[PDB]
Write an enzyme that holds these catalytic residues in place. Structure first.
Site, PDB file in Angstrom:
ATOM      1  N   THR A   1      27.004  35.568  31.969  1.00 25.85           N
ATOM      2  CA  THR A   1      28.073  34.539  32.124  1.00 25.85           C
ATOM      3  C   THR A   1      29.229  34.834  31.181  1.00 25.85           C
ATOM      4  O   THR A   1      29.022  35.076  29.993  1.00 25.85           O
ATOM      5  CB  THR A   1      27.545  33.117  31.838  1.00 25.85           C
ATOM      6  OG1 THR A   1      26.554  32.764  32.815  1.00 25.85           O
ATOM      7  CG2 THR A   1      28.685  32.085  31.870  1.00 25.85           C
ATOM      8  N   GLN A   2      30.444  34.819  31.719  1.00 24.18           N
ATOM      9  CA  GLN A   2      31.644  34.989  30.911  1.00 24.18           C
ATOM     10  C   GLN A   2      32.743  34.070  31.423  1.00 24.18           C
ATOM     11  O   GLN A   2      32.506  33.190  32.254  1.00 24.18           O
ATOM     12  CB  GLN A   2      32.150  36.445  30.929  1.00 24.18           C
ATOM     13  CG  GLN A   2      31.183  37.502  31.440  1.00 24.18           C
ATOM     14  CD  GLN A   2      31.235  37.639  32.949  1.00 24.18           C
ATOM     15  OE1 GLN A   2      31.186  36.642  33.671  1.00 24.18           O
ATOM     16  NE2 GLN A   2      31.357  38.874  33.432  1.00 24.18           N
TER      17      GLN A   2
ATOM     18  N   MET B   1      23.141  36.758  36.713  1.00 21.90           N
ATOM     19  CA  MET B   1      23.943  35.779  35.974  1.00 21.90           C
ATOM     20  C   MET B   1      24.997  36.448  35.086  1.00 21.90           C
ATOM     21  O   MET B   1      25.328  35.956  34.008  1.00 21.90           O
ATOM     22  CB  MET B   1      23.036  34.844  35.162  1.00 21.90           C
ATOM     23  CG  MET B   1      22.113  34.002  36.027  1.00 21.90           C
ATOM     24  SD  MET B   1      23.026  32.849  37.074  1.00 21.90           S
ATOM     25  CE  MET B   1      23.546  31.638  35.861  1.00 21.90           C
TER      26      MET B   1
END
Ligand SMILES: *[C@@H](O)[C@H](CC(C)C)NC(=O)[C@H](CC(C)C)NC(=O)[C@H](CC(C)C)NC(=O)OCc1ccccc1
Ligand SMILES: [Mg+2]
Lengths: 233, 244, 235, 212, 240, 222, 231, 195
Positions: A1-2, A107
């Site tokens: 996730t970013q 993810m």
């Protein structure tokens, strides 16, 4: 996730009788800052495919490298690399679509929305979309981001269904794309006047146009607009 | 490839013997003799250091008798370096048991564990076995005073009196002759030294060529004391028993 | 010494060829396939009279529609049976159906060549896998430690195999009944066995579509032995 | 969902409803909350549909493997414990299961085990599981005896589910009945609540609050 | 890790390492098992080359795997401990998961399976041990006696012997044991077991160990004096 | 924070006949209030006379269908070109779905075909693999609008025979393929009117012993 | 001699004996023929039985809708390699939506076989394969050897007595290459080719095995009464 | 689960444990035995999170039974309690800890003394004359502080235990459906069938 940092806005495209057209502006935004003014977001693959990418630019440059590497790899032990066993648009898309869905499933997505435009071996038009979620779809007209909301309505007036494609010439299609880009400059706060446009025709091949500008703009009527209601001066 | 150079340490002979175990036992038969004798009121451990020198620092030296915990000790016969590997493992095992159950480890359980480690090197791994034989002298509240022995095969057995190392055949015959069940520690001390004195390959048995230890309930009231004898104390017990 | 997966100059794997010699030393097992069912029979071969013969388990159930007989180093078969049972049940779990006899046999044969320097050597046992499915009907397979399997109308494995196979060559036809097949297995077992055939040193079994895989009782086999003796004395 | 099971003279009665929901939306009225693991074993399903279906058909594969290896029918105790040990491994991961493993063997007799996704495993004579469990318990506890006829016991189980189907919003559809004996289980039909309610009301004289 | 294939086939179809493990069993002290009508007796030889032994603490030849099953053996003593430990662990594991103690057949099948696994696994040699496993299934009064060997094959026996000079005692049992009428009592069964060992043992003093197992977890080991009385009675009848 | 799931809208419908089966679905694909495509096929011929659709999050739907088509291919390789029965396909799909129990395929799956007796069959799945054979099932966005209509017009629920007044039910007479397609078309026409995510086009796949046939019908594009 | 104990050892003349012994296993195997025109590619295989009660061992394996092979030698090794091809053909379709080229399929088989010839512990594959296929550049026929060597050909044959069929194809080269848009005649030429390798035995109904792939023809295998037409 | 009590008298240890099993709104069972025999002269009662309690108890039981067979010897209550504590002390720093509290009542045959150990899920061990887990101690310890002696008989211990249960039945909100009482002494473990 970013979270996406340096970003690119809309990519718009449509089919016409003998091929496909695709376009995207040359801006790399850093939030509200219009930081980088010379970013090419249309990346050709061979002489039959153009990949238009929006969203995170660092991830775009990564994808750009994957495609460059794909061409190299396809040429290995392939005497028909510039002929029967050359890379097709359908091959390039499915590869990207595979990568995007794999990355979302870990993810750790590639924060992009991609449109692969091209012409197949048999002369058939290819136009398909894929994004950070791995979601895919095809349509006579395709657009990302703001283009989805503003360009598609305009381009669908030209090609509303499949039967309208043979009736649409390259001059009419390019005219519609260039108009759509003007509209996005009027209304998208993260767009630039400068853009690139690519045509892939089954007869005349790949035509890549750089350093285009939005022109024939309407602003004169602004002089008559005064205040926000009651003000006269 | 590498197969070419493999000795295959863990295989049977046509007769059904383990080559490496048999050869390890041959190694141990040249080591200094160690004797254990169990009495009603304690256990004796006696052992002979191998051809020493006058310039060897004896009072700080230890090659035969080792302490596993406060209740259990071992006499070594074979490669000293191999023995210390196993001794440190046994010391840890005793402490693990103490931490888990909050009780001192029963002698047999410790012996079985070390013997199982030795067994493993004869069945798998492709490594050479430990060239060591132990005499375990220990006490617990279940069986009281106990003597065990283990060898490179990983097989262990209990004893009233036993010898390992050199001249065990001769030593075992002498012990079998003079040993009695109602025997006491002071008598067992005398038997152990007399047996070594006769089986030794040296000209005479002296204090500087011996390691000695006793496990006695001769500790103030219901408890057990380990006594590793000092050089001067070995010299005195040699005069007392009438050997020097 | 030499590699476990080494080829001979003739193009055969040494270890596989040597395991086939161990199978020749094993007790006889015979299988016969008919349109009414498949029959499996084995020689028990007890080493001593004090050995309770009913504990000798050389015929084994894999599923309700698949049975199995063994010959050679029978201890090696236990893991093969375990795998076969697991494969049969697992396929039913994944597909809500019975597994094809051929597919089951193929799964067992995949284990065969998984040896090297995985297990340290090939299996020293051959299997006769008999069963029924809706597609290919009643079937009999011969699974070897080479990883190869042949389908058979009739087959014998073990110490009396080549003598029994020659007998099966003449006797088998496409119109055999189940009763005729039972007697035929008993006849050929009695021929190649060292000791005299009875209900205690020989065991029969069959697989039918209706009843599935069944190991025969010693009382049931005893009657078939008595029926055999009389019909041979009849001419 | 509402499920029950109880021991009695003539073996075990198992009765379940047939409703499945997604929030207030009724997804299905025709679901099998009972799974036949084998001619002698039954499993009830409450909580997550998928979790229960998947792991109970898996349980049947494990029970089949047991009787292949051991040449003997699996005990209800062993079967239940395989499932309970499995879900205990997944404890904390989010499985949602409330099940009764019901069966009859020679050594045990008729036996019921409550098995839970929390890892709970309980042996007992009577169990009711699901969102309508409290409604079913009311009827069961007041009318239960050891000396019940198979006919009367079947009705009590049917009636207890009906009671819950009426009051519990997330229970209903139809009633599936099973009777488990020394010689295995026996299905006793699908009973639509839409028809059963009016039938029971008329014949029994109950449900006087409702008008019909 | 050490992966070397030690157990392999030879041109004549033999696995020599497994066969040499049987030779280790042949060297081991004699062990015998006899089952009566309502009991099983396990007899074991103790070689009298080792005196000055402490018989209180010396590892006994017969080992309890559970309260209802016992295991004796012939062969390498160190190897036997590994099988006994594994068997004891599996017995408790079976009780834990199945909620019922092991059957004698199941426990045998497990131990035999372990022995087989060591004949086609890399880097390991076979166990130089054959076992006699005896006992009674839970809630069952039928006696059970099984044998295992290094190859991994196992089977049930009315009576059986293993170890050194087992050929002789098997000869004795084959003529003296009647299947139609087995030893009806404990006395008769123990007597037949002691008799069979007396064909091989030497002196009937501390060289014979006897362990009687009866139904419902009733296991007891006979003492020296109790066995000595059997030894006395057998020879006094023989003087005729 | 990154959200790995999305909602592509759409609606699907499976009905089982006496000797046939249909699986229908609209051709519209959407995100939020925008249209992605007016014609994006959602129901697929998977081989062995089986049709399939995985409705909801299209990326997960495409992935699942792709994996099941793959499963059919390998079923032929591994089991001597044996035909995969509808019941065996259903069980296989359960394991595909439950395999991702702790990171689910966010889809409502429906398959249709013929059983081994030649009778029409429809199977319905939830996102984590629970399944059940059914005579009738709608899935997706407008499933709540369509299913009650099907309870009424396919299973004749709450319908009785005139004159008897609630005593005798309407008999469950079998429906032809022409009669079923009428109910499907009316279902989607009604759903298009009241649900914003439904429209553009309707594609129906009909399955008989003779094979798999297709029919397409226009829907309102607003 | 001293240099054939394992695959990791060159001989003094630079030979790999374990690989050569693996090559020998192919020669013991039953004959199989491969040939192609511009439109179609055909495999013909003589199946071998154990005895009269036994079935005839299958020789042809399908890899994809447009590709497959025939085997000669260790059948389990052919199962391993055909399984690998199935996966690689499948990876190409799933990831790139692209049918795997026959030439690239050969390159993958070569590299897989090679690793087994240079490492200690393992062994070479004991089987030879004839791969046919129709891709974007038309019909193709490949010959695989477990040394790693893969070769594209108009026609060939491997197995016992394969030299007879290989000579016939070398004469007929100009004729059978021209058989375009006529599958039956191309099979006839293949059946006539494999007939040159027969001794004592002849082509029966359960003996013969044929496979074909072409322009509008998926890879299909013919056995039993389906090949009686060509006997 | 809910209430578990323990009391060590002159010549025995007495453990009392509730019979109720409540899963949410309903009481699913009213005859549950919250105890396992670890060895002939050692009994362990338990209470904590559902599933974990039985899983932990049976795991400990299996380990002690394994020890007994291996050594042909019964471990002392002190030794068993130390083993149990270590398992819980190990457990508390695991991925998912055992949420189980226990009482261990045993008769030491060597010292001829009864022994009661209280251990919580953290691995906190204390030897006590009387003990409890959960909210039970809040009511019962005041009574035990008053009435307890080291020289009490088993019958006196049961009477003092009845007074504890009566107080719990009066002042606790939850209906725990009575208790199963078990005595541990020199002769082993037995259950009081009428309480
Ligand atoms: C009654 O307990 C019943 C028993 C089954 C045998 C049907 N269970 C349910 O009704 C249960 C309700 C619970 C979860 C509140 N419903 C489901 O499990 C349900 C079944 C489908 C067929 C309606 N599935 C469900 O709610 O969705 C799972 C899901 C949803 C969204 C995303 C991931 C997973
Ligand atoms: Mg609409």
């Amino acid at each position: 996730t970013q979270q996406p940092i340096v970003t690119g806005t809309s990519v718009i495209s449509m089919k016409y009788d003998n091929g496909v057209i695709i376009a995207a502006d040359n801006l790399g935004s850093y939030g509200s800052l219009l930081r980088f003014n010379g970013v090419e977001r249309l990346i050709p693959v061979g002489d039959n495919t153009v990949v238009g990418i929006s969203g995170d630019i660092s991830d775009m440059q990564h994808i750009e490298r994957l495609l460059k590497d794909l061409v190299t790899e396809n040429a290995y032990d392939n005497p028909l690399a510039d002929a029967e066993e050359a890379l097709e648009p359908s091959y390039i898309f499915e590869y990207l679509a595979t990568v995007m869905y794999q990355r979302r499933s870990k993810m750790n997505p590639l924060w992009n929305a991609i449109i692969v435009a091209g012409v197949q071996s048999n002369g058939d038009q290819f136009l398909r979309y894929v994004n950070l979620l791995g979601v895919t779809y095809s349509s006579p007209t395709l657009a990302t981001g703001f283009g989805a909301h503003m360009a598609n309505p305009l381009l669908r007036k030209v090609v509303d269904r499949e039967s309208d494609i043979p009736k649409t010439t390259v001059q009419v299609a390019e005219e519609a794309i260039v108009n759509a880009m003007r509209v996005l400059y009027y209304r998208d706060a993260r767009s630039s006047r400068n853009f690139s446009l690519a045509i892939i025709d089954k007869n005349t091949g790949l035509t890549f146009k750089k350093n285009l500008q939005v022109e024939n703009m309407k602003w004169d009527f602004a002089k008559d607009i005064k205040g926000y209601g009651t003000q006269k001066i | 490839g590498s197969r070419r150079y493999d000795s295959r340490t863990t295989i049977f002979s046509p007769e059904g013997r383990l080559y490496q175990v048999e050869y390890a036992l041959e190694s141990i038969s040249h080591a200094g003799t160690a004797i254990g004798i169990m009495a009603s009121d304690g256990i004796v451990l006696a052992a002979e250091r191998k051809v020493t020198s006058t310039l060897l620092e004896q009072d700080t030296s230890t090659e035969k008798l080792y302490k596993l915990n406060d209740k259990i000790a071992v006499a070594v016969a074979g490669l000293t370096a191999d023995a210390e590997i196993l001794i440190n493992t046994a010391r840890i095992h005793a402490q693990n048991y103490l931490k888990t159950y909050n009780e001192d480890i029963p002698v047999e359980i410790l012996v079985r564990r070390l013997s199982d480690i030795k067994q493993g090197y004869t069945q798998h791994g492709g490594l050479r076995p430990f060239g060591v034989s132990f005499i375990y002298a220990g006490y617990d509240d279940r069986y009281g005073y106990q003597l065990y022995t283990s060898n490179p095969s990983g097989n262990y057995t209990g004893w009233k009196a036993i010898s390992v190392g050199a001249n065990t055949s001769a030593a075992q015959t002498l012990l079998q002759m003079d040993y009695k069940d109602d025997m006491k520690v002071d008598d067992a001390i005398e038997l152990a030294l007399k047996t070594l004195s006769k089986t030794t390959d040296s000209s005479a048995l002296t204090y500087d060529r011996l390691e000695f230890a006793t496990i006695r309930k001769g500790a103030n009231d219901g408890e057990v004391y380990q006594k590793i004898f000092k050089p001067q104390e070995i010299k005195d017990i040699l005069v007392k028993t009438g050997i020097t | 010494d030499r590699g476990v997966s080494t080829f001979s100059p003739e193009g055969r794997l040494f270890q596989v060829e040597y395991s086939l010699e161990a199978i020749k030393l094993g007790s006889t097992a015979i299988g016969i396939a008919t349109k009414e069912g498949v029959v499996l029979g084995v020689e028990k071969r007890a080493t001593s009279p004090l050995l309770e013969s009913d504990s000798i388990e050389k015929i084994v159930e894999i599923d309700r529609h698949i049975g199995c007989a063994m010959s050679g180093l029978t201890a090696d078969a236990r893991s093969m049976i375990e795998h076969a049972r697991t494969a049969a049940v697992t396929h039913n779990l994944y597909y809500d159906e019975d597994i094809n006899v051929e597919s089951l046999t193929q799964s067992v044969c995949d284990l065969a060549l998984r040896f090297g320097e995985l297990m340290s050597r090939p299996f020293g046992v051959a299997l006769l896998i008999a069963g029924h499915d809706a597609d290919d009907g009643y079937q009999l397979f011969h699974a070897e430690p080479s990883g190869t399997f042949y389908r058979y109308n009739a087959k014998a494995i073990g110490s009396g195999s080549e003598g029994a196979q020659a007998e099966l060559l003449n006797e088998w036809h496409s119109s055999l009944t189940l009763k005729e097949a039972e007697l035929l297995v008993l006849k050929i077992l009695k021929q190649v066995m060292e000791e005299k055939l009875d209900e205690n040193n020989a065991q029969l079994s069959c697989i039918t579509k209706q009843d599935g895989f069944k190991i025969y009782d010693n009382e049931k086999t005893a009657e078939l032995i008595k029926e055999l003796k009389e019909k041979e004395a009849a001419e | 969902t509402t499920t029950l099971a109880f021991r009695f003279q003539g073996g075990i009665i198992v009765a379940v409803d047939s409703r499945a929901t997604a929030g207030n939306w009724v997804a299905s009225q025709t679901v099998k909350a009972v799974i036949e693991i084998n001619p002698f074993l039954l499993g009830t399903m409450a909580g997550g549909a998928a979790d229960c279906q998947f792991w109970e058909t898996w349980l049947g594969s494990q029970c089949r493997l047991h009787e292949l290896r051991e040449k003997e029918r699996i005990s209800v105790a062993a079967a239940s414990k395989i499932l309970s040990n499995l879900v205990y491994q997944y404890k904390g991961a989010g499985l949602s299961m409330g099940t009764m493993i019901c069966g009859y063997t020679r050594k045990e007799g008729p036996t019921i085990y409550y098995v839970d996704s929390d890892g709970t495993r309980l042996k007992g004579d009577i169990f009711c599981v699901g969102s309508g469990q409290t409604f079913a318990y009311g009827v069961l506890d007041s009318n239960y005896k050891w000396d019940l006829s198979v006919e009367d016991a079947l009705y009590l189980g049917k009636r207890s589910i009906l009671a819950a189907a009426h009051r519990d919003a997330y229970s209903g559809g139809s009633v599936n009945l099973y009777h488990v004996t020394e010689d295995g289980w026996i299905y006793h039909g699908n009973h639509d609540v839409g028809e059963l309610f009016w039938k029971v009301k008329e014949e029994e004289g109950s449900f006087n609050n409702v008008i019909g | 890790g050490y992966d070397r294939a030690l157990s392999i086939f030879s041109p004549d179809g033999h696995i020599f390492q497994v066969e040499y493990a049987l030779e280790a069993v042949k060297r081991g002290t004699c062990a015998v098992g006899v089952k009566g009508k309502n009991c099983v007796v396990l007899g074991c030889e103790r070689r009298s080359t080792l005196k000055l032994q402490d018989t209180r603490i010396t590892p006994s030849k017969v080992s309890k795997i559970d309260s209802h099953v016992v295991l004796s053996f012939s062969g390498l003593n160190a190897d036997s401990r590994i099988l006994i430990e594994k068997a004891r662990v599996e017995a408790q594991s079976h009780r834990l998961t199945l909620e019922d103690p092991v059957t004698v057949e199941y426990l045998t099948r497990y131990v035999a399976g372990v022995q087989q696994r060591y004949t086609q696994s890399g880097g390991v040699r076979p166990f130089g041990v054959s076992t006699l496993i005896a006992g009674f299934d839970p809630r069952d009064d039928e006696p059970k006696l099984y044998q295992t060997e290094p190859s991994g094959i196992y089977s049930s026996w009315s009576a059986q012997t293993i170890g050194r000079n087992s050929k002789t005692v098997r000869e004795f049992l084959e003529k003296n044991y009647d299947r139609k009428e087995p030893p009806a009592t404990v006395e008769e069964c123990v007597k037949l077991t002691v008799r069979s060992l007396l064909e091989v043992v030497q002196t009937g003093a501390k060289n014979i160990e006897i362990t009687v197992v009866k139904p419902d977890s009733d296991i007891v080991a006979l003492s020296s004096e109790e066995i000595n009385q059997y030894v006395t009675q057998i020879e006094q009848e023989k003087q005729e | 924070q990154f959200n790995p799931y999305g909602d592509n809208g759409g609606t699907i419908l499976g009905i089982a006949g006496e000797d046939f089966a249909v699986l229908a679905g609209d051709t519209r694909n959407i995100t939020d209030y925008s249209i992605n495509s007016r014609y994006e096929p959602k129901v697929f011929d998977c081989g062995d006379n089986i049709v399939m659709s995985a409705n909801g999050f299209a990326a997960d739907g495409d992935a699942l269908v792709k994996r099941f088509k793959n499963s059919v291919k390998w079923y032929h390789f591994d089991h001597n070109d044996k035909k995969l029965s509808i019941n065996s396909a259903a069980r296989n799909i359960q394991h595909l779905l439950y395999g991702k129990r702790f990171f689910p395929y966010y889809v409502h799956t429906i398959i249709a075909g013929l059983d081994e007796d030649g009778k029409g069959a429809v199977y319905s799945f939830d996102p984590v693999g629970s399944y059940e054979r059914e005579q009738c099932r709608a899935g997706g966005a407008a499933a709540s609008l369509i299913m009650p209509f099907l309870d009424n017009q396919v299973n004749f629920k709450n319908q009785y025979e005139p004159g008897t007044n609630g005593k005798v039910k309407k008999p469950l007479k079998y429906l032809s393929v022409e009669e079923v397609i009428k109910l499907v078309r009316d279902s989607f026409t009604s759903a298009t009117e009241r649900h914003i995510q439904v429209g553009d086009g309707l594609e129906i796949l009909i399955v008989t012993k003779d094979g798999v046939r297709k029919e397409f019908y226009e829907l309102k594009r607003d | 001699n001293n240099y054939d104990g394992d695959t990791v050892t060159f001989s003094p003349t630079g030979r790999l004996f374990q690989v050569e012994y693996a090559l020998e296993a192919i020669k013991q195997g039953s004959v199989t023929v491969g040939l192609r025109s511009n439109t179609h590619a055909v495999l013909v295989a003589l199946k071998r039985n154990a005895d009269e009660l036994s079935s005839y061992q299958k020789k042809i394996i399908k890899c994809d809708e447009h590709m497959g092979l025939s085997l000669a030698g260790l059948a389990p090794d052919a199962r391993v390699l055909s399984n690998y091809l199935r996966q690689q053909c499948n990876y190409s379709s799933l990831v790139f939506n692209r049918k795997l080229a026959v030439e690239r399929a050969g390159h993958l088989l070569c590299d897989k076989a090679q690793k087994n010839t240079q490492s200690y512990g393992g062994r070479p594959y004991g089987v030879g394969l004839l791969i046919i296929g129709y891709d974007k550049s038309g019909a193709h026929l490949l010959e695989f050897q477990p040394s790693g060597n893969v070769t594209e050909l108009y026609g060939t044959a491997i197995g016992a007595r394969s030299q007879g069929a290989k000579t016939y194809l070398e004469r007929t080269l100009d004729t059978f290459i021209k058989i375009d848009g006529n599958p039956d005649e191309l099979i006839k030429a293949g059946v006539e080719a494999i007939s040159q390798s027969l001794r004592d035995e002849s082509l029966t109904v359960d003996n013969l095995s044929i496979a074909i792939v072409g322009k509008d023809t998926p890879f299909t295998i013919y056995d039993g009464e389906a090949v009686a037409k060509y006997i | 689960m809910d209430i578990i009590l323990g009391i060590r008298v002159q010549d025995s240890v007495i453990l009392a444990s509730s019979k109720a099993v409540t899963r949410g709104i309903s009481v699913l069972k009213d005859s549950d035995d919250k105890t396992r025999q670890l060895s002939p002269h050692t009994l362990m009662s338990f209470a904590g999170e559902a599933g974990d309690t039985v899983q932990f108890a049976e795991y400990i039981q299996a380990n002690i039974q394994l020890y007994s067979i291996r050594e042909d010897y019964e471990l002392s209550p002190q030794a068993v309690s130390s083993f149990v504590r270590q398992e819980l002390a190990k457990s508390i720093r695991s991925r998912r800890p055992y949420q189980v509290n226990v009482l261990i009542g045993g008769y030491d045959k060597k010292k001829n003394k009864p022994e009661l150990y209280q251990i919580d899920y953290l691995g906190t061990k204390v030897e006590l004359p009387y003990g409890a887990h959960g909210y039970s101690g809040f009511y019962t310890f005041s009574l035990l502080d008053h009435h307890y002696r080291p020289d009490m008989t088993t019958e006196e211990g049961l009477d003092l235990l009845k007074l504890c249960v009566q107080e719990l039945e009066k002042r606790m909100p939850m209906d725990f459906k009575g208790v199963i009482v078990k005595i541990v002494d020199k002769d082993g473990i037995r259950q009081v069938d009428d309480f």
